[PDB]
Design a protein around this ligand. Structure first.
Ligand SMILES: Cc1cc2nc3c(=O)[nH]c(=O)nc-3n(C[C@H](O)[C@H](O)[C@H](O)COP(=O)(O)O)c2cc1C
Ligand SMILES: Cc1cc2nc3c(=O)[nH]c(=O)nc-3n(C[C@H](O)[C@H](O)[C@H](O)COP(=O)(O)O)c2cc1C
Ligand SMILES: *[C@@H](c1ccccc1)C1C(=O)NC(=O)NC1=O
Ligand SMILES: *[C@@H](c1ccccc1)C1C(=O)NC(=O)NC1=O
Lengths: 304, 313
């Protein structure tokens, strides 16, 4: 009598789980593996018109690499089985102009197939360019340019914030753009640094070893960002991303406000079989509490 | 022939370790325990001009991989820590730092005016907190570069001695460059402590479905293993950008290997917060032994043989 279904963006998703953009989604074989999996959805690698490393408590990466917009647009147009599950496409152009150009072309494919855009405003490894959403004027201009060029709804992938003045400013900007229908919190925590004791060397080569953190390191930061935007953007959906390894982690993301739950580091380590385990663990927690649907507790974190 | 000594700021420190501000340093009993410990130094709780009781409890919580807190600046008040520095601290045991965290530039400058004669006579060293993440309505001062500059200007006018600054974590090179450009314009800033807690994380208990600390809807500063790669990145970013200042490392230190990495990234002193909260002051015996082990396996005889020498790829 229980269900993980999520009914959003006019679709019924079988469950809230999907891969995080950039994990298991660059090669046609990875897309296929994601489509074959029990995940509720999947998203493509952020496309444009040692770089990874496993840590004890997560991951660090300086990917900075994609088969181009045309490969993922082509996959969205005539290669993805939409009868299996809905599909998201991530774009991370190097300017508002590039982003707008890519959106003009995705518009027909989005109308004819139903693929959904997530705009990446938070790459932390872009040489010479800080996270777009750490610059609220650039953020506003990207969103305006995309809203004028792109007729369909879209979502935004946000970087983590760390104080209420930034939450308030970010939400006030997003609330002016009705085409932004969902907000994904969070991208990796930017520009961490990992050093190996034995070699006394950084573990990734680009950018003097600085890279984005994922995994167990980022979970309380991810929950905070999910909840902060859930409270400030009641007219939008929040997707949670960050630190999910168990159905109990996913349960907390939903409690904080998440509609969908994306899985990055833990999926990179465990492969697509993880979604079989995650759905069963989440249903297990719900059973123990007597919940029958996610709508019963999404966003219902209590003050103590 | 191996040595953990640090010679900085006109002082000799027996080793690089001290508490992080706010941990085991609020009462006379805690400060005495830190002085009797084997730490190379110690720092007082960040203080305000008047006594404060802090945020309502629970305001601290132990996490799987660290801590979250919204302490809210509970502290005995500046007069108490000034008196400890002036009259109670045994400087023949080790040097002392005092952390101040007034709610405005003027509050800080007034405290510095009274601290100045005690610093001159006794040698206590000031650390200015520009990174509380739990001040109601006032964001981390160092997240607002105009306010940061204003604070440093006000302190530098009011205070004749060199001092240090406790910094929040930054997460992109544009902010590192902007913060370092400001710090490099104030010659009295002699050390930079990276980092304060990662601000405004959130923890929820599965069983009760509720936040685990009371203030601010459950939001609070993260310490511990969560913050270690961020802390090293901040230590190294400012080590590279502020060669004329010392960097003190703070964040995620539970072992001598963690401390070794802080020093490799550029740290002169290494501060210990969450781990010391959990283990108590005997931790410093373990950390010095562990760091000496790392050094012995590598043939290092002094910290200057590898401080700041992290290798690129
Ligand atoms: C190797 C790797 C590549 C990634 N590539 C992208 C990307 O292209 N676009 C994006 O928005 N996020 C990207 N991410 C970030 C993830 O989508 C996610 O936000 C982050 O890893 C936090 O989730 P996690 O804790 O489950 O790893 C990447 C992460 C990793 C580890
Ligand atoms: C309970 C608690 C109280 C703290 N109080 C202060 C403080 O008064 N002033 C300050 O600069 N930092 C304070 N901090 C931050 C620590 O000094 C330190 O920067 C942070 O905990 C990261 O270090 P760690 O990973 O070793 O815990 C406090 C941290 C905790 C957990
Ligand atoms: C940013 C990215 C990289 C290549 C193409 C498009 C976007 C990406 C990264 O490298 N590391 C991250 O942690 N998150 C990202 O989104
Ligand atoms: C901030 C603080 C502010 C005024 C007086 C004393 C302490 C403090 C906090 O509450 N939590 C932290 O993580 N770091 C701090 O410095």
């Amino acid at each position: 009598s229980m269900s993980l279904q999520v009914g959003i963006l006019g679709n019924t998703f079988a469950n809230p789980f999907m891969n995080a953009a950039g994990v298991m989604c660059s090669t046609e074989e990875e897309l296929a593996a994601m489509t074959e999996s029990t995940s509720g959805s999947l998203i493509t690698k952020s496309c444009t018109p040692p770089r990874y490393y496993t840590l004890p408590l997560g991951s660090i990466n300086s990917m900075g690499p994609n088969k181009g917009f045309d490969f993922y647009l082509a996959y969205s147009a005539r290669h993805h089985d939409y009868s299996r599950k809905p599909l998201f496409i991530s774009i991370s152009g190097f300017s508002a102009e590039e982003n707008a150009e890519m959106c003009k072309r995705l518009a027909p494919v989005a109308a004819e197939k139903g693929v959904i855009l997530e705009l990446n405003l938070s790459c932390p490894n872009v040489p010479g360019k800080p996270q777009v959403a750490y610059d609220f004027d650039a953020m506003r201009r990207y969103l305006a340019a995309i809203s004028e060029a792109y007729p369909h709804p879209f979502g935004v992938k946000m970087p983590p914030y760390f104080d209420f003045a930034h939450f308030d400013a970010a939400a006030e900007i997003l609330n002016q753009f009705p085409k932004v229908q969902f907000i994904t919190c969070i991208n990796s925590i930017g520009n961490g640094l990992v050093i190996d004791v034995e070699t006394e060397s950084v573990v990734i080569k680009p950018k003097q070893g600085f890279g984005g953190l994922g995994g167990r390191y980022v979970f309380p930061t991810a929950l905070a960002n999910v909840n902060a935007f859930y409270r400030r953007c009641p007219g939008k959906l929040i997707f949670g991303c960050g630190g999910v390894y168990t159905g109990e982690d996913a349960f907390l993301h939903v409690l904080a406000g998440a509609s969908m739950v994306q899985v990055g580091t833990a999926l990179h380590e465990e492969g697509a079989a993880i979604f079989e385990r995650l759905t069963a663990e989440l249903l297990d927690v719900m059973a123990k509490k007597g919940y029958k649907a996610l709508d019963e507790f999404r966003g219902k974190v209590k003050a103590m």
